[PDB]
Amino acid sequence: FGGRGLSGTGPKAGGPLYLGRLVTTAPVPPQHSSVHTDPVLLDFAKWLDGKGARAEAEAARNAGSSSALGLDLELPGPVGERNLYTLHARGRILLVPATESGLYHQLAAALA
Amino acid sequence: REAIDFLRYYAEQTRRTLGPGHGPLGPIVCISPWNFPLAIFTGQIAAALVAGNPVL
Amino acid sequence: APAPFADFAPPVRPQSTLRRAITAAYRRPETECLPPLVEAATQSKEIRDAAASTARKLIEALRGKGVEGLVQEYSLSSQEGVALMCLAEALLRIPDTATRDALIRDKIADGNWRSLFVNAATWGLVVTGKLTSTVNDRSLAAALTRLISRCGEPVIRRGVDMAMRMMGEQFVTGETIREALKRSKELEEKGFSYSYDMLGEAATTAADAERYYRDYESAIHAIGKASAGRGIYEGPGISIKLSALHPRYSRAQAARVMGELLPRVKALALLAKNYDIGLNIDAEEADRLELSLDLLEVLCLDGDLSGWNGMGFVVQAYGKRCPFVLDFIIDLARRSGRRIMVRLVKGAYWDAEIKRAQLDGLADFPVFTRKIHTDVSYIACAAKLLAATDVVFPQFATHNAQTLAAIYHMAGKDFHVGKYEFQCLHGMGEPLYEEVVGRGKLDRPCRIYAPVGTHETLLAYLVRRLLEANSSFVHRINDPKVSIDELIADPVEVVRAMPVVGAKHDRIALPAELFGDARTNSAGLDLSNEETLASLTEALRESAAMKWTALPQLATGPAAGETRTVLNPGDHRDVVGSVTETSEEDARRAVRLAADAAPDWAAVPPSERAACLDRAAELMQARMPTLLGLIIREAGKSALNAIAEVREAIDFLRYYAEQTRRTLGPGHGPLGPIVCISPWNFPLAIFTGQIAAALVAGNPVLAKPAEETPLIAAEGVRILREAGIPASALQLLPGDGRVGAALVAAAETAGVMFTGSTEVARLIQAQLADRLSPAGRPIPLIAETGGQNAMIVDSSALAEQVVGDVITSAFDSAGQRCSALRVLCLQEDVADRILTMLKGALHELHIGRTDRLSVDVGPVITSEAKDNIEKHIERMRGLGRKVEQIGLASETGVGTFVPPTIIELEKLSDLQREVFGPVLHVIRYRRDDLDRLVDDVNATGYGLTFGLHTRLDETIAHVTSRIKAGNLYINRNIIGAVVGVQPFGGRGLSGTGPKAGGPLYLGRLVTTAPVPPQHSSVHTDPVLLDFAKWLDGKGARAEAEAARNAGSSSALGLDLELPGPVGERNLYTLHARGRILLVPATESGLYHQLAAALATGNSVAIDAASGLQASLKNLPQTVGLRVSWSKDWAADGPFAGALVEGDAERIRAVNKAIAALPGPLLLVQAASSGEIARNPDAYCLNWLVEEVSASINTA
Ligand SMILES: Cc1cc2nc3c(=O)[nH]c(=O)nc-3n(C[C@H](O)[C@H](O)[C@H](O)COP(=O)(O)OP(=O)(O)OC[C@H]3O[C@@H](n4cnc5c(N)ncnc54)[C@H](O)[C@@H]3O)c2cc1C
């Protein structure tokens, strides 16, 4: 339970991301992964390749893989009901970088 | 029931995930509403506690 | 010149009475097989009682006695278990124990740990008992991180030790024969014996076969040394697979098998004789059974092997031939005086046999379809063997305690070592047989089948060995919901009391019934069946004696013309027939005749037109042998490919007949005369498909076959006419391109169906653009052309499977398929090993005139084709590229052959032209560049077929979402698209669509398209919805309504699975086409065009010359992002279709300009402003989506 916009920060209560907000290093929640790779992330990684930002291109691909964007699960519950849990993009992320490499890393995280 | 469910849910989620590298934040202030004065009260506090944080 | 088909497929030896009884049973109906097996397996009530008691005691002992303990100790999920085992596997690849334990404690436990998960499907079966075709590597990565962070070094240590035990001790007896020999002494002391299985099969190259040979040679020495004169019963033996000893072990290559593989077996057998050990020939796929008998026969009759009784042979009781094979073997043992060791097994290839028989459209399966039938067969065959212990040595390999007990009591109380034995698998079978071996148990010996090999070798085929499944005995004994009473149930009595004895399994379709009620699958022919080959030999010879002719067959009768001979492309001395070619005058006359007869054909009801197609399908099925021989000699095709081609013609006829019955009514008016121009590379199938579709849609047809292949086309027309197509509805116009141009140019031609070169397609498009239909609309063109088809292979693929699929996809039909593999892309880490294997496989192909079953690759179609292809090869070689080529035999000089060729390129852009021959180009890529590679493949402009070999879900999702191709294939070859299963057709430079053998095809051949079966979607394009809201805000109320209706009517997002064979998933989806060129005349026209394009997911380029820029003020950003304006259409392409608004003069001028655009042939739809206002379907949404077929090999 929990929403977006004026309705909350998240993560949802009674959901698998909640505990990770309460520690300094978040764990990997059960079933938390996705085989989907964001195609704009992939394009950004290729562009990083082209200008030789090798460390940033690698970070971009790793974030593309690490992202759980596209997770699509059915949660156990009562009969006569389908209860689904999915992970979507959040929207537009405010990026406040200090350095160029910092910007590339932030962009990779957001695009992934 | 919801308070019970929070307790058992965060308990199981802890058993599935938390290890030594998942360090606690420290003291967590849990501020709860009057409309679910046991369930949300319990859920926030239980999650904070089981993550290794003392609770106010 | 050899006489045609005089040496097509002569048997190794004359077929004896016993051998004929085997062949006759190959695909015998299951209801005919079971009654004599039930009778042979019948035992007394007293024996059946004692057997059930012995079986109960064995099962009770079993149930009274690793990975599960690890899972429970650390609270692992299934995915964490699998991931842990994958990690352990990779840690065991670090050979130095010190560096590994170091890496664990210091780095891997700390957190940051070729995909780790390449073999996860195997570990998934170990951890969960469930098998998946592919690996969710992102889930496993998440799981691995989770478990390590939660449990640290201790769980990694437990996983490593567990995997070490399993891979070094449980799945194999030893890594080497020496180690396995050392580890065998313990159970030998207790009364077991051993047979060693040097994990290895399916030689791909000569070097691979030589490697397996010297492995077997060295193993026999090691086993014979250790046997130390204990003899063939007490002492150890070896098991070999014939497929390991030769890269072309098949009936089609029988002469090479007898000439090259048999001497190798004899040499190994001579060595086993020297040491007096057993040498067992393992049994493989059903189509190798009878071939292996010819080797067994020669070996057992070879006097150099006399004095030794160690020769052994497996027979598979799940096979319908099993009892007849045993009759043959027992007789051979009598004739030779050799006491042949016969291993009775159930069989290890069941899933694959079911899929193969369905794919091949054969009459029935060569294996039973209910597990209980195999059990009855096994017990029945055991009775036959126990009656022959004087001449054979029965070896009852089973883990099924019920089977075991039945045979134990069947055998009776009298026993001596050497009378018979049981057998089991190392690891798996010892718990059961420690309750059998020894004077304290049942006092019967058991031979342990002992795999020997390294981890890599073991992991290669461990999946199949583990499936040996909810119906398997070892699974059911560990299922606590299965009682012992269930386990000891007598299969013989269960089968005896079933309603129909031996009935096929209910949930497995016979090949003919793959499509259920929709249509009857075409039937193929089994080229491993000696009766089929003998009958085909005569039918093919008879076909070669016929004076085949093709004439201009007009509505008024055959016409006069110039006549020339048709020649075999594999041997120009072999005259196949005579073609009389059509004068241009008679071609133009034929179109007028078609136009005059159009109303009478359109007036035949759709169901009766469909019945003509179905009747023609029956005729082609009955005439397949003769059609085969004509296709072989006229088109240069192999028999296997000619069979598939005739099947495809049958499938087209029945598929379009069914689609018609599902869709066509009176409002779906025919176009009129349709010109069908077909290619030489599928001179019957594509010929028939285009013609059948046009006819059944109610159009008379002018059939223009490729000038190279007129005879089979004339025979197709004869068959269609016999089926009831009137002469005026189907006219045949043989000849060269001038005939086709005359047909296309004729004023009464109302549509063109073209399959062939891009060059001719563009000429046709330009000519059609010069005219309009009487209604003032463009003449529809379906044009299907070539592709620059690629396959991408990563380091998780199985090299042997890749190489087989590549050799087939690149070189089948001499690379003369539009779908043929042109560019293979190999991940850098596996490129050299796969290339080495690929080159070795290349040199095992037999190239020659195709009237021999042994020929793999025939000729190219013409001398000009040959010269064009070889000029490409020589240019590549001159640029310094590495070129591998098979050396051709001198006999090829009488035809036009190109040797299969492998060309190594630096970059995909080094290939700049379509090379329509047996020429595979290979490039290498770094893993991180996979996405750029897909960009590079897309950049060619083609989009026909594409192949991906990977086990990783993340890679599958990435590549298939980014590649732009109409036919996708995962973990299989990329050729031979099946009608109604992989509807065939690509995008870009590869075709216009709609796909042949797909549900949108008939709709292109009528003036008002029907709604195809299952053609809808609940998804509404979001940019369309934004545009509809914008239109309403602009006050364009009718246009907003039309947009909303287009949003609902669009089938964008359709996502269907099509019925097909088991072990494959065939998907059909509708996507956006891309960017549509919009050429509006009015503002309302522009809004309607935009609505149609946006509802189907497309972006647009709007003609700036319309001057309508002011009509799109204040567009939502979502819509604006899909909208560009073009002043120079050629500069702003490629487009994926066009929508045109104007009067007839304007449409013609725009259509001509579109025809001149470089790049893809655009599917254009045009309408007048008035038509847009009157007709809500002025633009058809069928032609604004792209069909995508994807075929995933899940086996
Ligand atoms: C020592 C040894 C050597 C072997 N060598 C070979 C060999 O060289 N070639 C070979 O092909 N096999 C061989 N096998 C057999 C194969 O590998 C399996 O071990 C065997 O089939 C399992 O049979 P079962 O009596 O142990 O188990 P069960 O559970 O009794 O029998 C399972 C078998 O039933 C059959 N079956 C399953 N489903 C169906 C169905 N729906 N319809 C019809 N039949 C079905 C299959 O054959 C399956 O293997 C060998 C087996 C052993 C023990």
Ligand SMILES: O=C(O)c1ccc2ccccc2n1
């Ligand atoms: O059958 C042909 O080979 C053929 C058919 C139609 C044609 C139209 C224009 C140019 C060449 C053609 N060639």
Ligand SMILES: O=C(O)c1ccc2ccccc2n1
């Ligand atoms: O009459 C012909 O043989 C002919 C005519 C036109 C052609 C155009 C392109 C290619 C081949 C052609 N062949």
Ligand SMILES: [Mg+2]
């Ligand atoms: Mg020509």
